[PDB]
Amino acid sequence: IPGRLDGKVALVTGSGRGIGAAVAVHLGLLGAKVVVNYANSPTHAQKVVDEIKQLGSDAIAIKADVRQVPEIVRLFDEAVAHFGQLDIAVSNSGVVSFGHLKDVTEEEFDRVFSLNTRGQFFVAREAYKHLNNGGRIIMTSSNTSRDFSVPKFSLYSGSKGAIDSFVRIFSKDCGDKKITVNAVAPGGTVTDMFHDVSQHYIPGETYTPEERQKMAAHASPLHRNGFPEDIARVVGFLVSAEGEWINGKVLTVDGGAA
Amino acid sequence: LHIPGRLDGKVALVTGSGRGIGAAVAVHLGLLGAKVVVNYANSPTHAQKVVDEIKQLGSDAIAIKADVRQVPEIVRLFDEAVAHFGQLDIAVSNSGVVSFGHLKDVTEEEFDRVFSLNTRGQFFVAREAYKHLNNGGRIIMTSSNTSRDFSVPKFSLYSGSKGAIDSFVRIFSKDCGDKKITVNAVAPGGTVTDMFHDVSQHTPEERQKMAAHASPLHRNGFPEDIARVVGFLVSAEGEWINGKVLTVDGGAA
Amino acid sequence: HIPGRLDGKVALVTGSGRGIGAAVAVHLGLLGAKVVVNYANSPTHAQKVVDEIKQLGSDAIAIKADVRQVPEIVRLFDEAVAHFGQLDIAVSNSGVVSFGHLKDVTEEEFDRVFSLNTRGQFFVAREAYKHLNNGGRIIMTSSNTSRDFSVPKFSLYSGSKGAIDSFVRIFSKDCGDKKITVNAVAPGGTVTDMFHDVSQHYIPNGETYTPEERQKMAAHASPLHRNGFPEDIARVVGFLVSAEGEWINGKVLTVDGGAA
Amino acid sequence: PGRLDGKVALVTGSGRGIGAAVAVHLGLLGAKVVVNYANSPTHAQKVVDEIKQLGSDAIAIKADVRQVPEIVRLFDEAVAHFGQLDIAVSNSGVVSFGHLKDVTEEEFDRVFSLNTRGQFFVAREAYKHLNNGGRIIMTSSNTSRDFSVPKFSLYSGSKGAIDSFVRIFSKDCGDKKITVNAVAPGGTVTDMFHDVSQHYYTPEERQKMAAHASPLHRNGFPEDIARVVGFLVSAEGEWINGKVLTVDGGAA
Ligand SMILES: NC(=O)c1ccc[n+]([C@@H]2O[C@H](COP(=O)([O-])OP(=O)(O)OC[C@H]3O[C@@H](n4cnc5c(N)ncnc54)[C@H](OP(=O)(O)O)[C@@H]3O)[C@@H](O)[C@H]2O)c1
Ligand SMILES: NC(=O)c1ccc[n+]([C@@H]2O[C@H](COP(=O)([O-])OP(=O)(O)OC[C@H]3O[C@@H](n4cnc5c(N)ncnc54)[C@H](OP(=O)(O)O)[C@@H]3O)[C@@H](O)[C@H]2O)c1
Ligand SMILES: NC(=O)c1ccc[n+]([C@@H]2O[C@H](COP(=O)([O-])OP(=O)(O)OC[C@H]3O[C@@H](n4cnc5c(N)ncnc54)[C@H](OP(=O)(O)O)[C@@H]3O)[C@@H](O)[C@H]2O)c1
Ligand SMILES: NC(=O)c1ccc[n+]([C@@H]2O[C@H](COP(=O)([O-])OP(=O)(O)OC[C@H]3O[C@@H](n4cnc5c(N)ncnc54)[C@H](OP(=O)(O)O)[C@@H]3O)[C@@H](O)[C@H]2O)c1
Ligand SMILES: Cc1ccc(CC2(C)C(=O)CCC2=O)cc1
Ligand SMILES: Cc1ccc(CC2(C)C(=O)CCC2=O)cc1
């Protein structure tokens, strides 16, 4: 069936919440067995797992802090040990930071890069090691990587610039087990990371999340916000057999937003 | 069992859909449950075989002859399209021509032969799609990995013609906003068609065999490798990809 | 000590009677190059620019030529070598702006814009290759609205220029066989009549405000809180067409001030 | 006209390669120059002498630009010694070769610590110490985006960060009229280049074959890169701001 992952096994970093959980649920709905990674949210992780079973697929929830390379090896090893194999691996887990360059401390740089940049690099490494031939790797970026220059968004933005460079090359290295590497580069997607940002990137903590959401709904010429489900559908296609001939590319899923 | 990206009750139009990538897109949209207008200019034989193929898998279709180099023919194309199927939801600009030659030997005639179809015709094919399309609709334009990624010698004219398209789709996506119509491009790499064979010179299948190893996946691009990306984009699920050139080259260098 | 001068060199700038072309031409003159000031409709300003270049101690001429007519481009490049003996540098600067929603764009309008902005630039670049000294320089002019900024009702202009970008990448390869560099400059918000006619539309109400008012408003858009001036682009161009600019070859440079 | 009289510039790793070319070029153009080394004081001394030789002043300052504390001292001592600083070139980098499967946490940390994190904080300390209307230059690679070389994923990543950095840095440094740009060198003949012509014969034999990458049929030398930095950091380069300039002479 076009678009489906029946008999495929997937892993998603940070799939208890946000775009993570919509991806896991969508791969599940598409036919794949889902390994749902969290670090701080076992409760929402279990809801995602149960939601996937309710629709007919299988899922488990493994805790692992993807800032820790040993916990990533354990994450993938345990994935393989439980479902038998891994076809698909979506590096989703990341954090936002906001600040003028003059006020960025070492501690803020390392927090962001450990997860966004370094953590995803090793999620990709262990993905290649653990993946069936024909498999899929997805990494997660930002339209603030190349397309939008928000002031005081340097640290986060470069953390993702590094992801764009990695995928192009990764798709070369990974071709030797016929694994395709792409990133998705979401724009404003309604999650707690979006609401934490809109507050700092609008003249401005005095507006309800609802109203910053309505303001940003205008940036899109479709007159709406992006949603986890929007980015999930694009990851779904990429990780299908039909999305094969997209390789080494970065897809921006923002809606034509300005 | 959930079936993604299906186009039942939708009508698609695909310029240049009797031969090559176009024919694969027409059929692919036909497989995903779209009624299809198959445009041709010179290949009525081929266009009919395409119309046939799409009825075969249980969707409706018609061939329409039209020179997308002629704006009056573009108007009449989209008119007949709406006359027959009563609506159009998806318009795909595929029709294109290749050119090869050092800037020094390029003529006014050769520039105009290429930009007439691959740039101007595509822009008016999109203008008529915006006017004839329904809200929630889909415009898809065709480019080339040569537009920006790859700098192949003696390929200026052609890569020019498509670089215009990359700019068009970004701005169009804002314009087509007021009918909630999304505009994107597919930028194919070397895809196995008559055109690829025409310019694998710069043993049709021997030169093909060379090109298999440019992609890390060690195989050529085939017309259906692009069709399936068009399929996702002109689905509901593709909506949040907008004003974006997708390069479909397999990772080719 | 004295970097990126153009002494002994000859340059041709298209549409160097007004705006960017004029300051480009003056800059290359400032830098020691003799300058062919092309124009199509502005012959008196073309002469003021020649006199300004002559006045700062170089030589220059004004040649009428419509870069929409290719034989007028061949004739332009012929006359320029006939008059100065040679040509090292060729700046494709001539273009027009168009505002309009796809729905309202006409054949006559599309052709108006593409014939000067694209076809024209292409053939300036063709005759430049043919007429130019080895080690020479070709520059074409794009816009930051070609890839960087997506502005509504700006499809036709933006596309006319996106072609320009693709062209300079491949032109660099073709033109390599005479050790000629081809780059482009993408200006963004440069105070000229083109900018004033564009601020009218891309501004909350537009004609309600003087052109200075709209200008003063655009100044905030830049991290350097000022507008772009033609001199800002002429400076980048002067580097590119210098001997020292050589290892920039095949790129589009965006000279917008870091602006949005 | 492109000159730097009364200006002071700092160049990280300007003892060797592109750096020294840049340090020597900013001197040629009238800048006084702080020459930063971490490992190579003997070359650093050569560069200071050369800049004294052509009629500008200079000083060598040891600082490992992996330690942020040593970046702080370097910039403090620079404003100490010359009593201002206009221009700051983040140059110091390293190269890494390996399939994604083979890359270790220690290699990534050796690469990012200097190429990405180090440069990030040189730019912070550049902005904190720099005069108004000043210049920050950072350093990438045509491998960040334009070219995709098997087994180059770490180096390219390290430098793709940099491209995003300079874009936003240009906005933040807009309160002190400071422009921020990266040059993205291609194959430039230095100690790092001979290192990976091997992995990707004699050096001269690998240089001769690399000369054909460019449509100008030349391999690329420090002076090529240094010229473009000289322009960006001159008054005339002001309108180039927030941009990645790829100096590969059109190569490959
Ligand atoms: N506007 C946007 O939403 C937007 C835009 C561009 C890019 N992105 C990217 O899209 C991806 C998803 O973000 P989101 O918006 O969904 O954000 P989100 O709601 O903040 O969710 C963050 C996710 O990251 C996980 N996570 C955090 N720290 C972790 C750690 N040390 N180890 C493992 N997992 C960790 C969280 O799980 P725990 O709860 O288990 O910690 C959570 O699942 C991110 O990579 C983000 O950078 C988002
Ligand atoms: N390597 C590749 O295949 C490749 C790579 C990059 C981009 N592309 C692009 O993909 C598109 C399809 O090309 P292809 O590769 O499939 O080429 P192809 O085999 O040459 O097919 C050309 C198609 O264009 C139609 N066409 C030609 N002139 C026309 C006109 N005046 N009016 C209407 N239709 C016309 C043809 O129909 P008639 O025969 O009936 O005229 C035919 O269906 C083109 O835009 C091309 O630039 C292809
Ligand atoms: N200003 C901006 O903000 C901006 C932004 C992006 C790009 N640009 C580009 O910058 C370049 C110059 O723009 P501008 O702003 O300086 O424009 P401008 O003030 O409008 O001047 C237009 C120039 O075009 C020349 N021109 C027009 N038609 C011509 C023809 N048939 N043949 C020869 N020359 C012709 C004009 O000369 P005549 O009077 O002699 O006809 C004049 O020199 C153009 O390439 C433009 O697209 C400008
Ligand atoms: N060379 C190329 O072909 C090429 C291509 C693309 C990009 N680049 C970039 O160009 C820049 C210059 O490279 P290159 O080719 O000149 O390389 P190079 O020959 O290897 O030179 C290395 C320079 O880096 C300095 N350095 C190294 N580690 C340092 C540290 N911890 N702290 C301070 N300084 C340090 C060195 O100083 P000590 O010896 O004193 O340590 C030396 O001056 C680099 O950023 C590189 O990534 C180069
Ligand atoms: C060096 C080279 C040049 C052209 C092709 C084929 C193809 C696909 C393009 O890349 C543009 C259009 C077209 O025919 C393949 C390899
Ligand atoms: C944010 C923005 C950037 C560019 C434009 C168009 C452009 C490039 C022109 O051609 C006229 C002036 C000018 O800014 C409009 C708005």
Numbering used by the authors:
A (entry chain A): 10 to 212, 214 to 268
B (entry chain D): 8 to 209, 218 to 268
C (entry chain C): 9 to 268
D (entry chain B): 11 to 210, 217 to 268
Give sentences from the paper:
Its overall structure is very similar with CbAR-emodin complex. The “gate” region (from residue 209 to 216) is visible, but the conformation is different. One carbonyl group of 1e forms the hydrogen-bond interaction with the amino group of Gly197. In all, these observations well demonstrate the exclusive stereoselectivity for 2,2-disubstituted 1,3-cyclodiketones catalyzed by CbAR-H162F to deliver corresponding (2S, 3S)-ketols.
In this study, an anthrol reductase (CbAR) from Cercospora sp. JNU001 with the ability for asymmetric reduction of various bulky substrates was identified and characterized. It belongs to the SDR superfamily and shares the highest sequence identity of 86.6% with 17β-HSDcl from Curvularia lunata. In both of crystal structures of CbAR-NADP+ and CbAR-NADP+-Emodin, the catalytic triad (Ser151, Tyr165 and Lys169) is well observed.
